[PDB]
Scaffold this active site. Structure first.
Site, short mmCIF file in Angstrom:
data_model
loop_
_atom_site.label_atom_id
_atom_site.label_comp_id
_atom_site.label_asym_id
_atom_site.label_seq_id
_atom_site.Cartn_x
_atom_site.Cartn_y
_atom_site.Cartn_z
N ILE A 101 0.83 -1.21 0.00
CA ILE A 101 0.00 0.00 0.00
C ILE A 101 0.87 1.27 0.00
CG2 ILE A 101 -2.13 -1.10 0.89
CD1 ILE A 101 -1.41 0.33 3.68
N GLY A 102 2.11 1.16 0.48
CA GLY A 102 3.04 2.28 0.60
C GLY A 102 4.50 1.93 0.38
N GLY B 9 8.64 4.01 0.73
CA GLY B 9 9.49 5.13 1.14
C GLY B 9 10.96 4.76 1.24
N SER B 10 11.79 5.69 1.76
CA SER B 10 13.24 5.49 1.94
C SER B 10 13.54 4.37 2.95
CB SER B 10 13.89 6.79 2.41
OG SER B 10 13.21 7.29 3.55
N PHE B 11 12.71 4.28 4.01
CA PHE B 11 12.77 3.28 5.08
C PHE B 11 12.54 1.85 4.54
CE2 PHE B 11 8.12 2.83 5.11
CZ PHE B 11 7.69 4.06 4.66
N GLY B 12 11.60 1.74 3.61
CA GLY B 12 11.18 0.49 2.99
C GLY B 12 9.73 0.51 2.53
N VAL B 13 9.03 -0.62 2.74
CA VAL B 13 7.65 -0.88 2.31
C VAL B 13 6.61 -0.82 3.46
CG1 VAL B 13 6.52 -2.25 0.48
CG2 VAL B 13 8.92 -2.69 1.02
N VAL B 14 5.34 -0.56 3.10
CA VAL B 14 4.16 -0.59 3.99
C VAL B 14 3.16 -1.56 3.35
CG1 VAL B 14 2.31 0.63 5.22
CG2 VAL B 14 4.52 1.76 4.93
N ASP C 246 8.16 15.25 11.43
CA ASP C 246 7.65 14.89 10.09
C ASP C 246 6.13 15.05 10.01
OD1 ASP C 246 8.10 14.34 7.36
OD2 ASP C 246 8.10 12.15 7.63
C1 LIG Z 1 5.08 5.46 6.78
O1 LIG Z 1 4.60 4.97 8.03
C2 LIG Z 1 3.33 4.47 8.09
C3 LIG Z 1 2.46 4.39 6.99
C4 LIG Z 1 1.18 3.88 7.15
C5 LIG Z 1 0.74 3.44 8.40
C6 LIG Z 1 -0.63 2.94 8.59
O2 LIG Z 1 -0.93 2.55 9.87
C7 LIG Z 1 -2.24 2.21 9.84
N1 LIG Z 1 -2.78 2.34 8.68
C8 LIG Z 1 -1.76 2.79 7.85
C9 LIG Z 1 -2.06 3.08 6.42
O3 LIG Z 1 -1.16 3.27 5.61
N2 LIG Z 1 -3.35 3.01 6.09
C10 LIG Z 1 -3.83 3.32 4.75
C11 LIG Z 1 -4.05 4.81 4.55
C12 LIG Z 1 -4.55 5.21 3.18
N3 LIG Z 1 -3.81 4.60 2.07
C13 LIG Z 1 -2.60 4.89 1.59
N4 LIG Z 1 -2.30 4.10 0.58
C14 LIG Z 1 -3.40 3.32 0.49
N5 LIG Z 1 -4.34 3.57 1.37
C15 LIG Z 1 1.61 3.51 9.49
C16 LIG Z 1 2.87 4.03 9.33
CL1 LIG Z 1 3.90 4.20 10.73
#
Ligand SMILES: COc1ccc(-c2ocnc2C(=O)NCCCn2cncn2)cc1Cl
Length: 332
Positions: free
Chosen positions: A24-25, A27-32, A134
Protein backbone atom coordinates in the site's frame (compact mmCIF):
# COMPACT_ATOMS: atom_id res chain seq x y z
CA UNK A 1 -1.98 -18.36 1.56
CA UNK A 2 -0.76 -17.54 5.11
CA UNK A 3 2.40 -15.91 6.60
CA UNK A 4 3.46 -17.01 10.12
CA UNK A 5 6.11 -15.04 12.06
CA UNK A 6 7.43 -14.93 15.66
CA UNK A 7 6.26 -11.49 16.89
CA UNK A 8 6.23 -9.55 20.20
CA UNK A 9 3.17 -7.40 21.23
CA UNK A 10 3.68 -3.63 20.98
CA UNK A 11 7.76 -8.96 26.52
CA UNK A 12 6.75 -12.56 25.51
CA UNK A 13 7.10 -13.56 21.79
CA UNK A 14 4.31 -15.48 19.96
CA UNK A 15 3.28 -16.97 16.55
CA UNK A 16 1.40 -14.27 14.59
CA UNK A 17 -0.44 -15.33 11.41
CA UNK A 18 -1.73 -13.07 8.65
CA UNK A 19 -3.13 -13.28 5.10
CA UNK A 20 -4.06 -11.07 2.04
CA UNK A 21 -0.78 -9.09 2.33
CA UNK A 22 -0.44 -6.31 -0.29
CA UNK A 23 1.82 -3.28 -0.90
CA UNK A 24 0.00 0.00 0.00
CA UNK A 25 3.04 2.28 0.60
CA UNK A 26 6.73 2.85 -0.26
CA UNK A 27 9.49 5.13 1.14
CA UNK A 28 13.24 5.49 1.94
CA UNK A 29 12.77 3.28 5.08
CA UNK A 30 11.18 0.49 2.99
CA UNK A 31 7.65 -0.88 2.31
CA UNK A 32 4.16 -0.59 3.99
CA UNK A 33 1.77 -3.58 3.62
CA UNK A 34 -1.94 -4.16 4.36
CA UNK A 35 -2.69 -7.60 5.84
CA UNK A 36 -5.55 -9.43 7.63
CA UNK A 37 -4.85 -11.20 11.00
CA UNK A 38 -6.11 -14.81 11.35
CA UNK A 39 -7.44 -14.86 14.98
CA UNK A 40 -9.62 -11.69 14.79
CA UNK A 41 -9.94 -11.04 11.03
CA UNK A 42 -8.74 -7.48 11.77
CA UNK A 43 -6.80 -5.45 9.19
CA UNK A 44 -3.27 -4.27 9.98
CA UNK A 45 -0.58 -2.12 8.34
CA UNK A 46 2.95 -3.55 8.39
CA UNK A 47 5.78 -1.00 8.13
CA UNK A 48 8.94 -2.90 6.98
CA UNK A 49 12.08 -0.81 7.77
CA UNK A 50 15.62 -1.97 6.72
CA UNK A 51 17.93 -2.40 9.84
CA UNK A 52 16.79 2.85 16.07
CA UNK A 53 14.55 5.38 17.91
CA UNK A 54 11.23 4.53 16.17
CA UNK A 55 10.51 1.22 18.04
CA UNK A 56 11.46 2.71 21.47
CA UNK A 57 9.17 5.74 20.92
CA UNK A 58 6.32 3.58 19.46
CA UNK A 59 6.41 1.24 22.51
CA UNK A 60 6.05 4.22 24.97
CA UNK A 61 2.91 5.75 23.31
CA UNK A 62 -0.73 4.99 24.26
CA UNK A 63 -3.14 7.64 22.93
CA UNK A 64 -6.44 7.66 20.96
CA UNK A 65 -4.90 10.00 18.30
CA UNK A 66 -1.69 7.98 17.69
CA UNK A 67 -1.49 4.82 15.47
CA UNK A 68 -1.66 1.72 17.73
CA UNK A 69 1.38 -0.60 17.67
CA UNK A 70 -0.12 -4.17 17.79
CA UNK A 71 3.04 -6.29 17.28
CA UNK A 72 6.67 -6.01 16.14
CA UNK A 73 9.05 -8.56 14.57
CA UNK A 74 12.43 -8.71 12.77
CA UNK A 75 12.54 -10.61 9.45
CA UNK A 76 14.18 -11.69 6.09
CA UNK A 77 20.76 -11.30 3.57
CA UNK A 78 19.36 -8.09 5.24
CA UNK A 79 17.39 -7.66 8.52
CA UNK A 80 14.16 -5.59 8.66
CA UNK A 81 12.12 -4.16 11.59
CA UNK A 82 8.39 -4.82 10.96
CA UNK A 83 5.90 -2.66 12.88
CA UNK A 84 2.37 -4.16 12.92
CA UNK A 85 -0.11 -1.32 13.35
CA UNK A 86 -3.94 -1.28 13.47
CA UNK A 87 -5.08 -0.40 9.91
CA UNK A 88 -6.72 3.04 9.37
CA UNK A 89 -8.38 3.40 5.87
CA UNK A 90 -7.53 7.00 4.93
CA UNK A 91 -5.11 9.96 5.29
CA UNK A 92 -5.74 13.77 5.47
CA UNK A 93 -3.58 14.02 2.28
CA UNK A 94 -5.83 11.68 0.18
CA UNK A 95 -9.05 13.36 1.43
CA UNK A 96 -7.64 16.88 0.79
CA UNK A 97 -6.41 15.80 -2.71
CA UNK A 98 -9.95 14.53 -3.66
CA UNK A 99 -11.37 17.99 -2.74
CA UNK A 100 -8.50 19.87 -4.45
CA UNK A 101 -8.88 17.83 -7.72
CA UNK A 102 -12.69 18.44 -7.72
CA UNK A 103 -11.98 22.24 -7.20
CA UNK A 104 -13.82 22.16 -3.81
CA UNK A 105 -12.65 23.09 -0.30
CA UNK A 106 -12.88 20.62 2.61
CA UNK A 107 -15.81 21.70 4.91
CA UNK A 108 -14.36 23.58 7.92
CA UNK A 109 -16.03 21.07 10.39
CA UNK A 110 -13.51 18.43 9.11
CA UNK A 111 -10.64 20.98 9.25
CA UNK A 112 -11.60 21.68 12.94
CA UNK A 113 -11.88 17.91 13.75
CA UNK A 114 -8.60 16.90 12.10
CA UNK A 115 -6.57 19.89 13.40
CA UNK A 116 -7.88 19.51 16.99
CA UNK A 117 -6.97 15.76 17.07
CA UNK A 118 -3.51 16.52 15.58
CA UNK A 119 -2.87 19.17 18.32
CA UNK A 120 -4.04 16.74 21.03
CA UNK A 121 -1.65 14.03 19.65
CA UNK A 122 1.15 16.71 19.73
CA UNK A 123 0.34 17.82 23.31
CA UNK A 124 0.75 14.14 24.34
CA UNK A 125 4.11 13.44 22.56
CA UNK A 126 5.63 16.85 23.58
CA UNK A 127 4.76 16.03 27.27
CA UNK A 128 7.45 13.23 27.04
CA UNK A 129 9.84 15.59 25.19
CA UNK A 130 9.23 13.63 21.93
CA UNK A 131 9.32 15.75 18.74
CA UNK A 132 7.75 14.03 15.65
CA UNK A 133 9.84 16.05 13.08
CA UNK A 134 7.65 14.89 10.09
CA UNK A 135 4.18 16.45 10.56
CA UNK A 136 2.54 16.49 7.08
CA UNK A 137 -0.97 15.44 5.76
CA UNK A 138 0.30 11.97 4.63
CA UNK A 139 1.16 11.07 8.26
CA UNK A 140 -2.33 11.86 9.51
CA UNK A 141 -4.43 8.69 9.33
CA UNK A 142 -8.25 8.98 9.16
CA UNK A 143 -11.35 6.87 9.61
CA UNK A 144 -13.76 8.68 7.16
CA UNK A 145 -16.94 7.49 8.95
CA UNK A 146 -16.00 8.36 12.61
CA UNK A 147 -13.64 11.29 11.75
CA UNK A 148 -11.05 9.81 14.27
CA UNK A 149 -7.50 11.00 13.32
CA UNK A 150 -4.31 9.01 14.16
CA UNK A 151 -0.76 10.41 13.97
CA UNK A 152 1.69 7.96 12.35
CA UNK A 153 5.29 7.53 10.97
CA UNK A 154 7.64 8.04 13.93
CA UNK A 155 10.66 7.34 11.65
CA UNK A 156 11.98 10.93 12.07
CA UNK A 157 10.85 11.23 15.75
CA UNK A 158 13.43 12.09 18.41
CA UNK A 159 13.36 12.73 22.18
CA UNK A 160 14.88 16.24 22.30
CA UNK A 161 17.44 16.88 25.08
CA UNK A 162 18.53 20.50 25.89
CA UNK A 163 22.22 21.10 25.03
CA UNK A 164 22.45 18.09 22.63
CA UNK A 165 22.52 18.95 18.85
CA UNK A 166 19.92 17.85 16.26
CA UNK A 167 20.00 17.59 12.42
CA UNK A 168 18.75 20.83 10.72
CA UNK A 169 17.73 19.10 7.43
CA UNK A 170 14.62 17.36 8.82
CA UNK A 171 10.77 17.37 8.10
CA UNK A 172 9.20 17.41 4.63
CA UNK A 173 10.25 20.65 2.86
CA UNK A 174 6.82 22.35 2.63
CA UNK A 175 6.24 21.78 6.42
CA UNK A 176 9.83 22.67 7.50
CA UNK A 177 10.07 25.39 10.24
CA UNK A 178 12.17 28.46 9.20
CA UNK A 179 14.76 27.91 12.00
CA UNK A 180 15.63 24.51 10.40
CA UNK A 181 16.19 26.29 7.00
CA UNK A 182 18.47 28.78 8.85
CA UNK A 183 20.46 25.71 10.00
CA UNK A 184 19.39 25.57 13.68
CA UNK A 185 20.62 22.58 15.75
CA UNK A 186 19.06 23.74 19.08
CA UNK A 187 15.40 23.72 18.06
CA UNK A 188 12.40 22.54 20.14
CA UNK A 189 9.11 20.60 19.68
CA UNK A 190 7.71 23.96 18.38
CA UNK A 191 8.97 22.84 14.90
CA UNK A 192 5.90 20.44 14.90
CA UNK A 193 3.63 23.42 15.67
CA UNK A 194 4.93 25.21 12.50
CA UNK A 195 4.27 22.01 10.46
CA UNK A 196 0.72 21.71 11.99
CA UNK A 197 0.17 25.39 10.99
CA UNK A 198 1.29 24.51 7.41
CA UNK A 199 -1.22 21.57 7.41
CA UNK A 200 -4.07 23.90 8.60
CA UNK A 201 -3.22 26.57 5.96
CA UNK A 202 -3.12 23.84 3.27
CA UNK A 203 -6.56 22.47 4.36
CA UNK A 204 -8.05 26.03 4.08
CA UNK A 205 -6.26 26.90 0.81
CA UNK A 206 -6.64 23.66 -1.21
CA UNK A 207 -2.84 23.47 -1.87
CA UNK A 208 0.42 23.77 0.23
CA UNK A 209 0.92 27.35 1.55
CA UNK A 210 4.75 27.22 1.10
CA UNK A 211 5.70 25.10 -1.98
CA UNK A 212 9.50 25.60 -2.07
CA UNK A 213 11.36 24.06 -5.03
CA UNK A 214 14.43 23.44 -2.72
CA UNK A 215 15.29 23.57 1.00
CA UNK A 216 16.65 27.15 0.37
CA UNK A 217 13.76 28.47 -1.86
CA UNK A 218 11.48 27.15 0.95
CA UNK A 219 12.50 30.24 3.01
CA UNK A 220 11.71 32.51 -0.02
CA UNK A 221 8.17 30.94 -0.14
CA UNK A 222 7.68 31.74 3.60
CA UNK A 223 8.94 35.38 3.04
CA UNK A 224 6.32 35.77 0.18
CA UNK A 225 3.61 35.52 2.93
CA UNK A 226 5.21 36.35 6.34
CA UNK A 227 7.63 39.01 5.02
CA UNK A 228 11.39 39.13 5.71
CA UNK A 229 12.26 37.95 9.28
CA UNK A 230 13.71 40.74 11.51
CA UNK A 231 17.29 40.47 12.94
CA UNK A 232 15.68 39.60 16.36
CA UNK A 233 13.48 36.88 14.75
CA UNK A 234 16.63 35.47 13.01
CA UNK A 235 18.46 35.48 16.43
CA UNK A 236 15.57 33.58 18.11
CA UNK A 237 15.52 31.03 15.19
CA UNK A 238 19.33 30.57 14.87
CA UNK A 239 21.64 32.86 16.94
CA UNK A 240 24.73 31.55 15.04
CA UNK A 241 23.37 32.87 11.67
CA UNK A 242 25.07 36.24 10.93
CA UNK A 243 16.35 36.73 2.00
CA UNK A 244 14.47 39.45 -0.04
CA UNK A 245 13.66 42.64 1.99
CA UNK A 246 9.79 42.81 1.63
CA UNK A 247 6.77 43.40 3.96
CA UNK A 248 4.29 40.74 5.19
CA UNK A 249 1.23 40.05 3.02
CA UNK A 250 -2.16 40.49 4.84
CA UNK A 251 -3.34 37.13 6.30
CA UNK A 252 -6.97 37.64 5.13
CA UNK A 253 -5.89 38.13 1.46
CA UNK A 254 -3.85 34.82 1.60
CA UNK A 255 -7.07 32.70 1.87
CA UNK A 256 -10.38 32.79 -0.13
CA UNK A 257 -12.79 35.67 0.85
CA UNK A 258 -15.18 33.45 2.86
CA UNK A 259 -12.48 31.65 4.99
CA UNK A 260 -13.58 31.79 8.72
CA UNK A 261 -11.68 34.65 10.53
CA UNK A 262 -10.88 32.39 13.53
CA UNK A 263 -9.13 29.91 11.11
CA UNK A 264 -7.03 32.88 9.79
CA UNK A 265 -6.31 34.04 13.43
CA UNK A 266 -5.19 30.49 14.46
CA UNK A 267 -2.93 30.28 11.31
CA UNK A 268 -1.14 33.55 12.27
CA UNK A 269 -0.47 32.27 15.83
CA UNK A 270 1.08 28.98 14.57
CA UNK A 271 3.10 30.40 11.65
CA UNK A 272 5.34 32.75 13.64
CA UNK A 273 9.05 33.33 12.88
CA UNK A 274 9.91 33.36 16.63
CA UNK A 275 9.62 29.67 17.80
CA UNK A 276 8.65 30.68 21.39
CA UNK A 277 5.87 33.04 20.04
CA UNK A 278 4.02 30.07 18.43
CA UNK A 279 1.08 28.51 20.37
CA UNK A 280 1.75 25.28 22.28
CA UNK A 281 -0.40 22.28 21.10
CA UNK A 282 -2.71 22.64 24.20
CA UNK A 283 -3.24 26.42 23.59
CA UNK A 284 -4.05 25.60 19.92
CA UNK A 285 -6.79 23.11 21.10
CA UNK A 286 -8.25 25.94 23.26
CA UNK A 287 -8.42 28.45 20.32
CA UNK A 288 -11.88 29.87 19.28
CA UNK A 289 -11.57 28.08 15.87
CA UNK A 290 -12.41 24.84 17.79
CA UNK A 291 -15.57 26.37 19.44
CA UNK A 292 -17.95 24.30 17.22
CA UNK A 293 -16.37 21.08 18.61
CA UNK A 294 -17.27 22.18 22.20
CA UNK A 295 -20.97 22.80 21.29
CA UNK A 296 -23.10 19.99 22.92
CA UNK A 297 -25.28 19.81 19.74
CA UNK A 298 -22.26 19.22 17.40
CA UNK A 299 -22.56 16.24 15.01
CA UNK A 300 -20.58 14.90 12.05
CA UNK A 301 -22.10 15.74 8.57
CA UNK A 302 -23.24 12.06 8.31
CA UNK A 303 -25.39 12.60 11.47
CA UNK A 304 -23.21 10.49 13.83
CA UNK A 305 -21.61 11.79 17.07
CA UNK A 306 -18.13 13.36 16.92
CA UNK A 307 -15.23 11.27 18.46
CA UNK A 308 -14.28 11.66 22.20
CA UNK A 309 -12.49 15.06 22.17
CA UNK A 310 -12.37 16.10 25.86
CA UNK A 311 -11.30 12.89 27.71
CA UNK A 312 -7.95 14.58 28.62
CA UNK A 313 -5.46 12.87 30.98
CA UNK A 314 -3.21 14.64 33.55
CA UNK A 315 -0.28 13.91 31.11
CA UNK A 316 -1.76 15.94 28.15
CA UNK A 317 -2.74 18.83 30.48
CA UNK A 318 0.75 18.91 32.25
CA UNK A 319 2.04 21.82 30.05
CA UNK A 320 -0.79 24.08 31.39
CA UNK A 321 -3.11 22.40 34.04
CA UNK A 322 -5.50 25.46 34.48
CA UNK A 323 -6.35 25.15 30.70
CA UNK A 324 -8.59 22.12 31.61
CA UNK A 325 -11.58 24.37 32.54
CA UNK A 326 -11.41 26.12 29.11
CA UNK A 327 -10.71 22.87 27.18
CA UNK A 328 -13.42 20.72 28.86
CA UNK A 329 -16.95 22.11 28.19
CA UNK A 330 -19.51 21.85 31.09
CA UNK A 331 -21.50 19.00 29.39
CA UNK A 332 -18.37 16.75 29.27
C1 LIG B 1 5.08 5.46 6.78
O1 LIG B 1 4.60 4.97 8.03
C2 LIG B 1 3.33 4.47 8.09
C3 LIG B 1 2.46 4.39 6.99
C4 LIG B 1 1.18 3.88 7.15
C5 LIG B 1 0.74 3.44 8.40
C6 LIG B 1 -0.63 2.94 8.59
O2 LIG B 1 -0.93 2.55 9.87
C7 LIG B 1 -2.24 2.21 9.84
N1 LIG B 1 -2.78 2.34 8.68
C8 LIG B 1 -1.76 2.79 7.85
C9 LIG B 1 -2.06 3.08 6.42
O3 LIG B 1 -1.16 3.27 5.61
N2 LIG B 1 -3.35 3.01 6.09
C10 LIG B 1 -3.83 3.32 4.75
C11 LIG B 1 -4.05 4.81 4.55
C12 LIG B 1 -4.55 5.21 3.18
N3 LIG B 1 -3.81 4.60 2.07
C13 LIG B 1 -2.60 4.89 1.59
N4 LIG B 1 -2.30 4.10 0.58
C14 LIG B 1 -3.40 3.32 0.49
N5 LIG B 1 -4.34 3.57 1.37
C15 LIG B 1 1.61 3.51 9.49
C16 LIG B 1 2.87 4.03 9.33
CL1 LIG B 1 3.90 4.20 10.73
Amino acid sequence: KVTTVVATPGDRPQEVSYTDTKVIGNGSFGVVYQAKLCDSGELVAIKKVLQNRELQIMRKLDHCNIVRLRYFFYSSDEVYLNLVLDYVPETVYRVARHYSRAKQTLPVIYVKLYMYQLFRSLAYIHSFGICHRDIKPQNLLLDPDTAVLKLCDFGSAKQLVRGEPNVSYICSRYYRAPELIFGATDYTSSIDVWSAGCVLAELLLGQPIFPGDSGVDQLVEIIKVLGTPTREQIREMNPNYTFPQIKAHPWTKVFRPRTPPEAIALCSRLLEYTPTARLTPLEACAHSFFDELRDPNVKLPNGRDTPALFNFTTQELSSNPPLATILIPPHA
